[PDB]
Structure formats: C-alpha cells, structure tokens
C-alpha cells in the first residue's frame, strides 16, 4: 500500500567548507536534487558530482534508492585541471 | 619573493611565505617517509630543515629511498648524511643539516627548542610521547607531528599545542554580495540582487559599503541570519534612514582557535578524519590495530614475522585488549589485524608518497597558521590492494635480496613481476609527471628484461618556475626537454628502468604517431596534464582502444584522482568540468564591476594593439602588394576586408621615438578620459529608465575621467610601457634614457591634447549581447580612406618599410618586455576610472596569465594515490577495489569514493550496450549486405534498420530504392582501400514506439575475409 510521505532535510557540503541545506522528499530523484542545487548555486546539472557514503550518486534513482535519510550529508566534488 | 616561488605564492600568500622564511623544522627518521617529507618541505621553501637519523645504509633501503645509491650501501654511510647533498640541491635557498647523534629516553631534549616544528618517523612510541610532552609544554609550544608507514598501513598525527590560532580556516577568498533592498525593522532584512543567491550561512559576519540612503550601515559589521536564498536578517535598522539603492556586502573571515590534546591522551580518545564514509568506523579500527603493533614492538623488541601464526595471534590478543579500554568498546577488525601482522615489516612507497604530501602540508600549517590543521589523526591505508589476494601463502612475500623486498612484503611477488612487465603511457612530464616517474621507479614498473616500457611524452623545454613543484629538474637543465631530463633522472633512481622519452603533445595532429596500435600495446595510460581539453582527448583515445586511464589534477591544496577501467566504469568524458569563466561582452567593454573585468580588458587591449592589428596589417599588404594597387581597387568599387582599418594604421604610423610617446599619450587620453566622457554622454549620471529606476544601478558603476599627470607613478608607468611597445611594433629604436620622466615631459611639453568630441555611437547594454558582428562601411569612411591613402602616396609614406609592422607575442614570465607592466597599469587606470579597487602586479600577473596555483604537497599526494590505483589496474582488480579521491588539504578533507559505474544504454528487447562494447561481423568474398543484416541479428539478437559508414549512407530502407542494396556484395557496397582488413560501421535499430528516431547501437567492425 502507498506509504506516508517522508519529508527530510539533507546537507550538501563542498570541499571548501560550505554547506547547502536542502528541503527534500525521500521520493525525489537524484535528477531533481541536481535541479534544486542549480537553483541554489547556479551550477548546471552536468557539472555536479555528488558523493554519498563513499558512492557516486547517479541519475534515474531516488534518494530512497541510495538509503539517504534525515540529516544525511552529501558532498559536491570537482576535478581540478593543474598538473 | 622569487620567480622560483611564483606558483605557490598564490597558494599561501605573502604573509605565510615570510613565516616559512623564518622557520626551522626538525625531521627525525630518514627512511622512505622522512625522505618524501624532506623533499616536499625543501621544495616548498621552508628556510631550515634538520634531517636526523641514527642508522646506516642497507641494501633494503634502495627499494624505498630515491636518493640512495649502491655506493652509499657499500660504504655504510649514515642515511641522513648520504642524502643530504641531494636534498640540498632541491633549492639552494634552504639550509639543510644532518644529525646522527643518539636519540633515546635519556637524551636531554632541550636542543629541540631551536625548532618551530618537530616531525618524527620510525620512532618508538614511548619516546614519541616523551618528545610530545616536552614539545607541547614549551613557553611557545613546539608543534609536533608523528607519521609512519608499516606495510600497507599508515598513521599521521598532529599536536600543535593546547591553543593554536588558525588565521585562515578555508583558503577561500571573501565573496562580494550586491544589495537590492534593506528594510527598516527589528531585525532589518537585506535582499540581494535578483538571480544571484548570496550563498551565505547563518552566523557569518559581513561589512558594508556604498549603501545610499540608509546611513549607519556603511563601515559596520553585522552578523547575519539566513531567511531565504536571497535574503538575510541583520541588526536593528528601525531608527535609520530609509534604504535608497546600491550597497556591497563582503564576508569577514574571523580567525579561529583549534585545541589539541597530547599524544598520550589522544591514543585513548582519538579524533580521526573520516576519509571513506562507506566505512566510518574504519579509522578507529585501524587506530586499535596500529597501537597493538607498537605494543608488540615494545613487548618483544621486534615486528611480527610474516606467516608466524603465534605472532599474529598475539597481535590479535593485544588488539582485543586495547579495544576493551576504548570508550565505544569497538569490535576488533580481524582482517585489519591479520594484514597488519602480515605486512608489518614491508613498506609501500606510493602510500608513503601520499602520506608524505599530507604530512608536509601539515608542517606548513604549523609554521604559518594558514589553513585548519588535521585534528588529530589520519589513517590512509592500502587494504584494497591485498583484499583480492584472499589469504595467500607467505612464500610469495618473503625477501629475496633485491631492491623490491620492501614492496614484495606488501603485495607479493606475483604482483611485483606484473608491475615489472607493464607497458604504460605517461602523458605530460611536469609536476605530477615527475612524481609519477619516481613512483614508477620505486615500484619497478617496466624494468623486466623481456617486456615492459615506460613511454613518456611532453612538448616543452624546462623553464624557471618549474623547479618549484618538479623535483627532477635543476637550474642547469634550463632549455633541456622535460621528458628527456626526467627520464635520465629516473634511471638514476632505478638503473633497470626502461623509458622511451618523446617530445610530442598528444592531440589530433599527432594521432598518426599515437595511433590505435600504440594504445593497444599499452597496459595503462596515465595523464599528468594541465588542461581539460588534453584530458578529454586522451580519454577518447583510451575509450576507443579499450584501455584503462588514470587521471589526476591539482589546484593549490585541491586535488582529485579518477579511475577509468574498460567494462567497469564510465570514462572521463561522461562528466563535464566547469568551463572558463565568460565575462559578458557589455560588462567587459562598457560596464566593469570587478578588478577581473579591467584585467581581462587590459589583456585584450594588449592583444589587439600589439599582436592582432600588426599581423592583420602585415597579411593585408602581403596579399595586395602596394598602396597604389589598393587605391586603384577602392576607386573601382572593390572592397577588401579590413582595408579601412589598415589604412588608418598606415596614416598614423609613428616615424621617431617622439611620435611613439605622443601615440602613447593619445591612447591614455582615449582609454582613461574620453571613454568616461562618452559613456556619460550616452547615459548621464542621473538618467532613468521607463520603470523610473536609475540606469546606473548595481552592478553598473559610472566612470569618471582621469587627468593625465606625469607625476603620478601609475600614469608614468602606462606612458613608458605603451610607448616602448609601440616603438617595438613600429621598429623605432629607443634607449633607456628616453624613458626618463624628464625626457618624457619635454617630448610632451608642446604637444596639444585634442579636446573630447562626443558621438551618437550606440553602446550595447544587453548582458547577452556577444559582439556587434560587423558594422557596414559608411560612405564617409570610404571617402576618408581614399584621402589618407593619397596623402600617404604623395608624401612617400607607403614604402616597403611602411607596409610592415613587428608582431609581439604575450610573454608573462619575462619582466623586461613590459607586457605585464603595461597590463597592470592599463587595468588599474581603468579600475580607477570606475572606482574599482586596483590590484598589484603579482595579482594582475596571476589573472592575466591564467596561472594555476600549485604546491608540491598536493602534487605528491595525488601522485601517490594514482600509483596505488595503478597497482589495482595491473592486477585486474574488481570494481569495488578501485577508489576515486576528491580532496582539499586546506580544510582538511579527503573523500574516497567508488568510481563511476558503467552505464547501460537500452536498444530494444532487453538488448543494452555500454561505451566499451564493439561488435564484429566476419564476412567472406561473396558476403552480401543481406548477409551482414542477418549476421548481426543472429549474433546479437536484433536486426539493423540503418547501416552508415561515417557520412556514407550504405543502407537506409526509408530512402527510395535502397532495398536493391540488400543483394549487393559488401565489397561493392563499401569500396575499401585504406584499411584492407575491415571497415567500421554505424548500425541503428527500430525503436520501441513506431515513428520515433532509430536507436543507435555499438560500433560494428566488418571484416571482409577470414584473417
Ligand atoms: O580595436 P579595439 O582593441 O577593440 O579598440 C577600439 C579602438 O580603440 P584603439 O584602437 O585606440 O585602442 C577604436 O579606435 P580606432 O583605432 O578604430 O580609431 C575605438 O573607436 P573610437 O575611437 O571611434 O571610439 C573603439 O572604441 P568604441 O568601440 O567605444 O568606439 C575601441 O574599442 P574598445 O577599446 O572598447 O575595445
Ligand atoms: O602541471 P605542470 O605544468 O607541472 O605539467 C603539465 C605538463 O603537461 C604538458 N602537456 C600539456 N598538454 C599536453 C601536455 N603533454 C602532452 N600532450 C598534451 N596535450 C605540459 O607541457 C606541461 O609540462
């Protein structure tokens, strides 16, 4: 049977000491989370790499598919170009 | 300070560098890890390092020490004294001293108060605690760092004393926010500009400036509370004047205090940096196991022996007892304990490389107060290298008397020999590339007599400012190739290494050299590049040839590693990096708001004046020969591209040094006076729009004209460098006495300044303008060009010497050419015109030159991590063993993570494919297109609906008459000659829902015969 809706607050941290607090639903897709981050940061979805609990989050899946819960922390990471 | 320190000055800042020029570091233990640390600190420019060691050289040490030679071993030299001269050479500004005095629990530690930081490796734990207690209780505390690698495990510890001041906690520059409205309330609510979230967090402090109306907030400090992405509350503004417009808010960075506990206390209640959040409990489990090893060494005066069941049972028993004394009562991890007992006597050089990078950055934090230090433990480990081995027998790990004993005791002889047999392709040979070659040498890569080869390529010669992060290059190597020099140095580290050094860049124009057969011969490709384009290109080549690729990169304290493995992962190009920042055309040309806008404008003006326009001038007269011919073609109605701009340059050509100064003076008047007056003519300071708002609303800033004054050093600097650059372009000789402020004032003394005359030229205000394309030539302009062309022909001012100009090339690293001085003066004059804060020469150079901050500490760290992943590639490890890493040592923060899972693209009927799939059909001489269609369906499950060869449409059933092609042979259909063996085809299939676009499949390689 259909479940009760489970709203949650999650944190997206950069590797520069910043924290983005997001109001999400557990049924949100990872695609939708990238869209919300674009609204907050101006970063296009195809530049966002999101890490949760040592795994890279991919499109087509939901927060619940990745067992992301209340107060979970995600990391927004980037590749650097120097060498 | 120096051009040797340029790239890293942008990481640390002048204040931190100066403290490093006054710091004395004491480093004890000169095994592999102490050497890595000493190499990093000396490269980073610590003023004085003492390297201490009490041990003699030993054959085993050749496996982990990249400066030791076999002659050192036969003479049994002290380990610190043997490497002293090699370390000193890393930069002659550093004082490197050796010490070999005994160092035990009866040693008077008073001699240590000469040092600001103490770094201890390979030291017994009881003595570490005694030194730690001494250090932390000095009147100013001596900062204390302890670091060790045992087999595949490591332990890093910092104790900077009870209260340590961090002056900059993040390494990030304060952001600026434009204000849109402020309410009169308690608390007052600030709203920032539309479409620009402030990106601030509750609790941060801001200062304010340029607010119009609400007097009392300018010059104040406010602590904010975030309300929405666009608004935050400040203090009480109820009593203040109403807000009108404008205003800029700037983050204030507050120093923070960090508290450290003693080593003794931290052993019982450890604070650990969590580097893999899939296993947040692992660092405490490692802490336990590694404390058990210290207790084993104390109890038995030796490390456990590999394969000795009693030793590992005892280590487990010690680990179990320690776990009971910890607060959480954490279960003992029997796998960690087993592999620690197994490998304790070995030493993993790439792990020491990575730990040594992190530990060296911690030393820099200890003597500078720049960046927040580790607090207090880091447990980098290489367990993913051995888990796939299962539980092997110990025969494969026993020493054999060669330099690889240290490594073999970590990973086993089978994997060592696979490393020795590797063919690897190292693309780029700068900072990362030099660290990689040294890491390859310690691992034995490509040393097998039979197989094995390191191919390294780089198009560049060695320059000054490279000796900072590239430890294989010396000043006497200037003008020598990077790849040749690094290859020769690596052979000194390991004489068995087989290296093939090239002078090429890897790009489309060298694809005939590095062709598919070349990649097919490699086992792994490793990039050491400084740009995104090269990375995406190399990635496309590895993907096309089913070869793994290990990429890495740094920027300052930031770094990454990425693992790309055929059939297991996505490739580099599955993700997009941040593009170069695009300053909008209108912002750059008419409405700057930041110093970055005026610097880019000055860089572009240099390019326009001294490179682009001279070369257009040259190519024009080369194409059209002489001035008489152009004059005849203009009067006969012809139009030549760029002709009117060329004639303008021809007519205004300066003839002597005096006219070069006059031209430079004229450009000052145009750029920094007339431009301001023209914008104010189009948009008066008080002009308003239809919505009643001011046109000069944030981020727009009104210009104000500048009056030329040779007594202003900024004005003199512009005039000097503009005049000497124009003299260079127009081939006018000049002496350095012609540059004096006295000589210049005389040349301009009787030179009239043309009064400003406005125009009704249209200036674009759209933030999405992007150039006005090309304005059509007017009838007046053509008439003026003919007048100037005749005037030049009549006065013999169109000879061969007049039809050419010298083209300059922007060179940021030569201070005598005036390029940077021109850019800095022009940028700061434009900034002053717009009331923007100017920037000094070093900041202007960084931004104009696109210089990427770099420091050897990060570079050594990511290179060590890449070498660990390369061991996994060599062994054909499963997907879960691999790790990408994303890190920033400023925080510090290290995020290991599984790499990108390969994605499946669905064709139809459950048939999917990945980026790695390639399909094959083997035909014969009479094999028809119908045979090809049936062969794909039988072998792969679905019938093609389209067959394409590049752009040739071989079979498209919806095109009229293509059914006749089914009966044609594949020979007559394709017509092959270049590749006699096969042809690569693009095959598509019928979609699930009729009428949609056909679905593409894997590339299909068709072989014409059976060979
Ligand atoms: O070629 P650019 O680097 O884009 O500079 C041009 C150039 O200025 P300078 O050549 O003196 O550096 C034009 O002058 P001409 O050489 O064509 O005579 C000038 O045109 P005006 O003098 O008629 O104003 C124009 O300015 P604008 O487009 O505002 O009319 C200005 O453009 P920028 O300095 O903005 O690049
Ligand atoms: O980061 P460093 O500047 O110390 O070294 C970068 C290194 O990479 C080389 N490089 C850039 N682009 C390349 C390339 N090598 C091979 N192919 C391509 N496309 C550059 O010369 C630097 O020395």
Author numbering:
A (entry chain B): -6 to 76
B (entry chain A): 40 to 1050
What are the paper's exact sentences on this?
The E1 enzyme Uba6 initiates signal transduction by activating ubiquitin and the ubiquitin-like protein FAT10 in a two-step process involving sequential catalysis of adenylation and thioester bond formation. The two human Ub E1s, Uba1 and Uba6, function as gatekeepers of the Ub-conjugation cascade by coupling ATP hydrolysis (adenylation) with the formation of a high-energy E1-Ub thioester linkage (thiolation). While Uba1 is specific for Ub activation, Uba6 exhibits dual specificity for Ub and FAT10 5,8, the latter being a Ubl involved in mitotic progression, immunity, and implicated in cancer. Two distinct architectures of the complex are observed: one in which Uba6 adopts an open conformation with the active site configured for catalysis of adenylation, and a second drastically different closed conformation in which the adenylation active site is disassembled and reconfigured for catalysis of thioester bond formation.
A catalytic cysteine to alanine mutant of human Uba6 (C625A) capable of catalyzing adenylation but not thioester bond formation (thiolation) was used in our structural studies to reduce sample heterogeneity and facilitate crystallization. Prior to conducting crystallization trials, human Uba6C625A was mixed with Ub and ATP·Mg2+ to promote adenylation, and diffraction-quality crystals harboring two complexes in the asymmetric unit (AU) were obtained. After extensive screening and refinement, a structure of the human Uba6C625A/Ub complex was determined to 2.25 Å resolution, with R/Rfree values of 0.166/0.206 and excellent geometry. Remarkably, the two copies of the human Uba6C625A/Ub-adenylate complex in the crystallographic AU exhibit drastically different architectures relative to one another. In one copy, the adenylation active site is completely ordered and the SCCH domain adopts an “open” conformation where the catalytic cysteine (C625A) is more than 35 Å from the glycyl-phosphate linkage of Ub-AMP that is nucleophilically attacked during thioester bond formation. In the other copy of the complex in the AU, the adenylation active site is partially disassembled and the SCCH domain adopts a “closed” conformation exhibiting a 136° rigid body rotation (relative to Uba6OPEN/Ub-AMP). This places the β-carbon of the catalytic cysteine (C625A) ~4 Å from the glycyl-phosphate linkage of Ub-AMP and brings additional structural elements important for thioester bond formation into the active site. An additional surprise in the Uba6OPEN/Ub-AMP structure was the presence of strong electron density corresponding to an inositol hexakisphosphate (InsP6) molecule located in the SCCH domain. In addition to conformational changes within the crossover and reentry loops of Uba6 that accompany SCCH domain alternation, the cys cap of Uba6 (residues 798-817) transitions from an ordered state in the Uba6OPEN/Ub-AMP structure to a disordered state in the Uba6CLOSED/Ub-AMP structure.
